């Protein structure tokens, strides 16, 4: 069993990866970290978190390492993945969280740099892409580079799966009202080519493209090409919600849709259920990838024309991370 | 009837007066009712967190505002039946408190000596007006009317245009809506709406709204064919409405965009953009709705088609501009 | 041991219960009074926008909350003299409504059957306790006591240490303070504080506070020597207190900081940090005040010296841990 | 001189243009350098999250902006020496990038054919100007000059008036300051400054500034007498500076306010308010600083006296107005 892990990109997602690993007392062992800064700065960011608060374990550092819960972790500072000295500590599986290696072509650099497998924390083109407890059974021993898609995908997928299986989804469109992230702007200024991303993220509702629905065929093959959607990025720091409007393959009531979602969430560590009147901050630190909200279910019908709107919460930082880590633990034991 | 009183000199009520002054209306605000002192109403009029300084002079006396040199009586009667509207001859009441959103309740303004009420919110089965959609329905004998919600003013012009051009068979709405005074600053009781008891500037809060459900009051042919809800989020004003529809015809995005553009032409109430705007860009809008071509989306599989269309709105000032047009026509009957 | 009643199950009132259970306190909370239904209180206790899910089970009946399987009676009496405290034998009331902040007002809890009241806000000239500064001034005869504001609880430990080590000749205080429920979500009337009427999540808002003015109730040697005020800013909790002092002695930054470290040693109410923290890092703190040596500043010209000292506080949970420490001593008397 | 280039079409860079157009300056912006396309600078000039739509037409080509029907070249040179300032006759450079804050560094604008540079930030030991305090120190032989920070333009007028009337023997400043582009959107490395790495809109963030430390360049007799810092907070623009001074005379609050009223009278750079304003009320201010008499505070204990004076400022637009004033005068020498 491959127990030894490297994290590339010790950011929002990367830091939480470590946090979650120590929280579930995993046999997986983080032996090296690569970013662009000093151990001092990484230690400060790891110790102090604006969203989840103080790190639950001891954090200290050296000129070339972090010391977390008494255990030493090497820190490297290589912009180019192929130069990361992963063999020095035996980093076997790389959790790729930088945002700059989101393809097989790009992420294979880690293999050149001496790692064995790569798990990418973002969509990454047409490669094996896993949403745990939806399609993790498609994983095998020959998968060497894998994607876990976006938080949004981990939110949409299990909801869509439940619907697909119970009723059919003949066509649908998704809007996620999504917390702001590092790809957006603090103040109005250039942010590559996306004009909207240029705008101050905490002062606006900002429409934003996402591939979650578009590329859903990678997770649920039978819905391939049948979903579209987008994001409205809004001023909350983490916690998001996905709405899916579907034409289903069967006439339904709200109760029928809600019972089917309940069943699919039963005995399911990835996919939660609620009928409580919750709001976005209640999902912060969720250990699910998705939490279906029965109180938002809505059936609109005129004769035989039926629209069905299903809604699910997700903590796009930690909740997602819990999915990444479930996927990682299975990856390592193949 | 050129003389007006305002009940509820709140976010809507105050902007009502700003807008009347902005368009040099021959309507005359003579009286204002609220729950507080003139000092406090005057500070609030003078200094606005969303729109900045009042462009006119503002002073007060122990019973009045003086706005741009003109005296406006202030009353503090929590029951509308006790507002002395006849003292300064207030004929038309712009009801902006949120406590009289029905025929039965706003009757109190007429028992109190006014002739007409225009309610700044939905109010059941009464004439409900979205200006430049169904304003031709207003009548000389109408005494109590609604301008519905800001959300309704945003949805209706979009739904009207899609209805006329393609037909809407069924549809559902979500508005990503700026927070409002019906919500809470900090977590705490807010009557019986549990979601509304939560800190509004720190949460995405789902919230019910009749905008889609009551659309039949504005566009009879769409009666019962829409439903919808809001997601309240931390921006102070400026909101967006997404409508997802099954249309009566197969379409292209370009065809939808051009139909909509046609409907916005020479339309003081319904605006158009294909610029990559965000919500703060709608703050101060003088339209009730601004349709956004950049977010049009056609999802097609074989014969099936879903069409997502989206319009922005300044739920405060933009809605107010619709309220004033509706009031300018209401007063000349 | 003792049985308590909570009046005002609000931001402070709910966190009092959370903290009592977290420390496995002997105190049993037996009754709660507020203005609403058990359903609404259970919703609010369960789901907290600042601290997340309640760590215990929460349920309700028509007259009660059930928390970790223990029943707590719920009443809805706006006048404290009508709260049936005797029905469950609540002898110590934790007064958290904002409406009984005087000895004559909180007396009504004793007329209703309680023995002692601890008030969760400044309450005039009464025994006013900052735990680990002046908790020794409590005795078997006190029946109504105050714990001051969160700001007093931030200020008084810093001021006491400076007092004891160097003397404070005079000083002034400014706290950059999270917004609270006394402010407004949207621009609108809020009693006679004009500034409190303005949208709290969208402004820096100057705001009056007695923490400095009434510090003598907690540190008698400093009566009349300190003034200050707050700037309310848009963070939901997490506040910081700066104090500019002329000290009695003449000092280096290092020396100020050593004095404060000693004062924070084996002191569960008052903490120290030399880490570059920001306000969200204090959220959930089990201190009333955390002195920050990084912000210490000595400005000096000739024999003239200004000393600025800065301390953080979670005005919500942090304060509450102080209230609970004080509440535990006050029960045992 | 009437021919200017802007390096750094950022928050400050864009408002420079907006302001020159607002005052009908007979300076013309002929060229603009940044790191992006004309399409992106046009989108940004046209849509502003703080100040709304551009008041004038904005269009572009692949190498220019068309603003109010006039062409302005756009270049994208990382290094200032590589900028074709020569080409359109760029005489005075407004250096608003943050990256060329010295004489040596802004030299490069001269090495590429510009005469003068006006830097929009503190720039070490060079001629540093707060308009209507020390603009009389500008001469014809000046090439590279600074207008310091917004905080310096806030602090200087107030300090100047206190110094003239009473003397400041020593003093310390805290500015409660709107977040800027130098801070982080989410927790992440921002060079070596640990505090600047933290999410700016979710925290009160202590932060260093030289406004007080370098006041000597603006007010030579206050040299080395002041210190201070900032608490960055979650508002988008609009800040406030607090100064605690030991003055050279005993004073009342009335005496301190009248002296400030006098200094502000027919002073287009420095404003006065007796109204209970909040940060958003300063947004769009045409002053560098607005002294607020409602926050003046005198703490007296015998011969010892601390005086807190407080001034508001729009760190974006308000600072800009000072910049222009200085620019217009720099041009004519
Ligand atoms: N934030 C979310 O909501 C979220 C959710 C799910 C997935 N993701 C995805 O996870 C990835 C990381 O997101 P994030 O939000 O943590 O971003 P982030 O900016 O917080 O973190 C990126 C980290 O990588 C470092 N980095 C950048 N370039 C690098 C390089 N060449 N080499 C090494 N380190 C480098 C940065 O210094 C930073 O620590 C992205 O692909 C993102 O799309 C994000
Ligand atoms: N804010 C928006 O986005 C928006 C948009 C469109 C319509 N509306 C509607 O307009 C109405 C007002 O909304 P708002 O945002 O201005 O509310 P708000 O809370 O800002 O204002 C309400 C005003 O009414 C006063 N008031 C309350 N009860 C009263 C009584 N019994 N008598 C007299 N005055 C009383 C308050 O003091 C306050 O000044 C509501 O019906 C609301 O649904 C709001
Ligand atoms: N930062 C803080 O929030 C903080 C810190 C220290 C002290 N305090 C003090 O504690 C007290 C409460 O502050 P809060 O933030 O919890 O307020 P809050 O508004 O969150 O809580 C008040 C609660 O009291 C209830 N209430 C109001 N009037 C009542 C009455 N007559 N009878 C019974 N219940 C009533 C409300 O329904 C609400 O649940 C205040 O005196 C406040 O100054 C607050
Ligand atoms: N924001 C404020 O409140 C404020 C107030 C007073 C002074 N200032 C000062 O003004 C300057 C600009 O601040 P800002 O807030 O506008 O920053 P900003 O980040 O908005 O603007 C910086 C602009 O410079 C551009 N840029 C960066 N490097 C460049 C280069 N090498 N060549 C050309 N362009 C480059 C960026 O693309 C951006 O458009 C800073 O020096 C700051 O200290 C800012
Ligand atoms: Cl590489
Ligand atoms: Cl898509
Ligand atoms: Cl509905
Ligand atoms: Cl005081
Ligand atoms: Cl300094």
């Amino acid at each position: 069993s491959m127990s030894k892990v490297g994290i590339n990109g010790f950011g929002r997602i990367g830091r939480l990866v470590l946090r979650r690993l120590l929280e579930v007392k995993s046999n997986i062992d983080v032996v090296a970290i690569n970013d662009l800064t000093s151990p001092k700065i990484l230690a400060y960011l790891l110790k102090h978190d604006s969203n989840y608060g103080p790190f639950p374990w001891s954090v200290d550092f050296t000129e070339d390492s972090l010391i977390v819960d008494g255990k030493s972790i090497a820190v490297y500072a290589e912009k180019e993945a192929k130069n990361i000295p992963w063999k020095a500590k035996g980093a076997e599986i790389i959790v790729e969280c930088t945002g700059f290696y989101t393809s097989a072509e790009k992420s294979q650099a880690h293999l050149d740099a001496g790692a064995k497998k790569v798990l990418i924390s973002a969509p990454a083109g047409e490669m094996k892409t896993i949403v745990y407890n939806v399609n993790d059974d498609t994983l095998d021993g020959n998968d060497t580079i894998v994607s876990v898609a976006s938080a949004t995908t981990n939110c949409l997928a299990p909801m869509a799966k439940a619907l697909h299986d119970s009723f059919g989804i003949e066509v649908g469109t998704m809007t996620t009202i999504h917390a702001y992230t590092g790809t957006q702007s603090l103040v109005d200024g250039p942010r590559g080519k996306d004009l909207r991303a240029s705008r101050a993220a905490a002062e606006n509702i900002i429409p934003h493209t996402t591939g979650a629905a578009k590329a859903i065929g990678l997770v649920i093959p039978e819905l391939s090409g049948k979903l579209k959607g987008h994001a409205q990025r809004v001023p909350v720091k983490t916690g998001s919600v996905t709405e899916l409007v579907s034409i289903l393959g069967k006439k339904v009531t709200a109760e029928e849709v809600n019972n089917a979602l309940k069943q699919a969430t039963t005995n399911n560590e990835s996919f939660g259920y609620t009928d409580e009147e919750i709001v976005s901050s209640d999902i912060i630190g969720s250990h699910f990838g998705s939490v279906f909200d029965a109180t938002q279910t809505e059936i609109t019908a005129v004769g035989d024309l039926q629209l069905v709107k299903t809604v699910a919460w997700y903590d796009n930082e930690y909740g997602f991370v819990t999915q990444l880590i479930r996927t990682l633990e299975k990856f390592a034991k193949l």
Side-chain angles (χ1 to χ4, degrees), chain A:
Chain A
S1 186
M2 296 190 166
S3 41
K4 287 199 200 203
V5 156
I7 296 166
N8 200 35
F10 207 52
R12 294 311 306 150
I13 296 306
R15 299 206 288 283
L16 297 181
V17 164
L18 181 62
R19 195 193 279 234
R20 178 57 177 180
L21 281 168
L22 298 181
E23 189 179 62
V24 301
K25 300 140 109 301
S26 180
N27 301 315
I28 290 174
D29 207 70
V30 176
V31 305
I33 285 156
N34 187 72
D35 205 280
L36 309 162
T37 185
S38 56
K40 185 194 213 282
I41 291 166
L42 296 185
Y44 170 81
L45 297 173
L46 184 65
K47 189 166 174 173
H48 309 292
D49 196 274
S50 305
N51 292 351
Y52 301 95
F55 201 61
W57 298 274
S58 62
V59 181
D60 185 27
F61 65 94
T62 76
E63 73 193 357
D64 68 4
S65 70
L66 299 185
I67 300 158
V68 184
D69 192 45
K71 295 181 192 190
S72 174
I73 306 181
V75 172
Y76 310 130
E78 304 291 330
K79 301 134 63 193
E80 289 181 286
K82 67 189 175 77
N83 297 337
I84 296 161
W86 291 134
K87 274 281 214 308
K89 302 284 165 187
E92 290 164 301
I93 306 184
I94 304 318
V95 190
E96 172 45 60
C97 311
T98 66
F100 285 87
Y101 299 96
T102 55
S103 65
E105 173 60 45
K106 289 173 156 159
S107 270
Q108 69 187 25
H110 291 304
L111 311 179
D112 312 344
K116 307 298 189 233
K117 292 194 191 162
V118 180
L119 196 57
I120 303 178
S121 76
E126 272 166 12
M127 69 166 64
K128 185 58 63 67
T129 292
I130 307 299
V131 174
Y132 205 91
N133 277 328
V134 175
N135 78 329
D136 56 298
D137 292 342
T138 57
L139 281 184
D140 68 23
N142 302 319
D143 293 305
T144 308
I145 311 185
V146 173
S147 170
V148 284
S150 61
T152 301
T153 300
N154 278 259
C155 183
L156 176 69
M159 176 162 69
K161 188 71 159 81
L163 289 176
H164 165 56
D165 288 341
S166 296
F167 313 115
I169 299 181
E170 308 307 330
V171 66
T173 178
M174 174 220 74
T175 288
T176 172
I177 299 95
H178 191 309
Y180 65 87
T181 65
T183 59
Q184 289 185 255
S185 297
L186 181 51
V187 306
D188 288 14
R191 201 74 166 93
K193 308 298 286 161
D194 184 334
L195 306 199
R196 289 176 149 146
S198 82
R199 305 303 293 285
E203 311 299 328
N204 296 288
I205 297 161
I206 301 180
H208 190 60
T209 76
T210 164
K214 192 185 157 139
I216 192 61
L218 301 183
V219 184
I220 312 159
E222 316 97 312
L223 303 175
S224 176
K226 306 200 174 160
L227 305 186
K228 288 196 182 168
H230 88 147
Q232 298 286 12
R233 290 296 182 89
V234 301
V236 288
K237 65 196 197 182
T238 199
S240 297
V241 56
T242 297
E243 309 192 349
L244 177 65
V245 176
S246 293
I247 305 172
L248 300 185
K250 180 170 179 314
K251 196 159 183 153
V252 299
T253 61
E255 174 173 45
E256 184 175 357
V257 175
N258 293 341
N259 297 324
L261 275 288
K262 203 190 194 165
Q263 286 315 294
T265 62
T266 295
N267 306 331
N268 189 343
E269 295 282 59
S270 299
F271 195 22
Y273 191 83
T274 195
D275 58 22
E276 292 173 12
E277 294 290 315
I278 60 160
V279 303
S280 75
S281 73
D282 303 319
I283 211 65
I284 290 172
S286 180
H287 306 159
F288 298 110
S290 194
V291 179
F292 174 81
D293 184 352
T295 70
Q296 295 187 67
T297 305
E298 165 194 85
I299 314 300
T300 316
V302 175
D304 290 304
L305 300 164
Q306 180 178 257
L307 285 180
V308 183
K309 181 187 283 176
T310 46
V311 184
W313 299 93
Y314 60 123
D315 181 357
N316 48 288
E317 289 193 343
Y318 208 72
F320 169 69
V321 165
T322 68
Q323 288 291 81
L324 193 154
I325 294 298
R326 295 171 184 107
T327 300
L328 173 64
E329 308 247 28
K330 166 167 210 151
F331 203 27
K333 299 172 148 170
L334 298 167

